[PDB]
Amino acid sequence: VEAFCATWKLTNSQNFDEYMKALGVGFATRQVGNVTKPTVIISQEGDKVVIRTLSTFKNTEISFQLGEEFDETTADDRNCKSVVSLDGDKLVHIQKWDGKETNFVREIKDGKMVMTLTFGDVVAVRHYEKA
Numbered sequence: 001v002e003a004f005c006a007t008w009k010l011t012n013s014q015n016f017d018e019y020m021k022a023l024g025v026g027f028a029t030r031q032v033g034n035v036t037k038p039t040v041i042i043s044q045e046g047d048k049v050v051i052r053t054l055s056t057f058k059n060t061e062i063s064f065q066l067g068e069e070f071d072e073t074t075a076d077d078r079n080c081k082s083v084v085s086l087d088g089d090k091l092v093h094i095q096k097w098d099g100k101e102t103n104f105v106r107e108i109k110d111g112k113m114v115m116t117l118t119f120g121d122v123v124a125v126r127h128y129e130k131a
């Protein structure tokens with residue numbers, strides 16, 4: 001977990017639009033969500049680990065205890081029952097909302113954080129540079 005903790009900036013995204021569509025994200029948010037390069041800052045608070053995200057649209061904060069379920073109102077408004085754990089190396093973040101399910105597996109590949117969003121059989125991939 002000590003390797004995820006840093007100020008990250010997005011550098012390259014891929015297939016996110018297709019993923020956003022899959023999630024059923026509204027047109028408006030898709031337009032901003034497609035151009036916006038956000039900053040995901042991951043840090044701690046002892047039993048808590050936080051994930052702040054900053055963009056020229058929305059900034060969203062989640063604080064949780066690993067493996068513990070919690071409620072999170074996603075940026076695109078879905079209210080999910082999320083759980084994020086460490087399946088070893090990878091930081092998995094599961095989001096469940098009215099029957100549908102989705103997951104985010106963040107990794108550190110050659111010192112670059114790579115997130116790989118997934119829903120149904122439509123995967124999306126993101127890249128982050130430690131700034």
Ligand SMILES: CCCCCCCC/C=C\CCCCCCCC(=O)O
Pocket residue numbers: 020025029032033034036038040053054055057058059060074075076
């Ligand atoms: C924080 C809002 C701006 C960044 C997200 C833009 C896309 C908006 C709606 C779709 C959400 C999919 C689940 C959240 C992914 C966040 C990715 C990130 O932190 O960069």
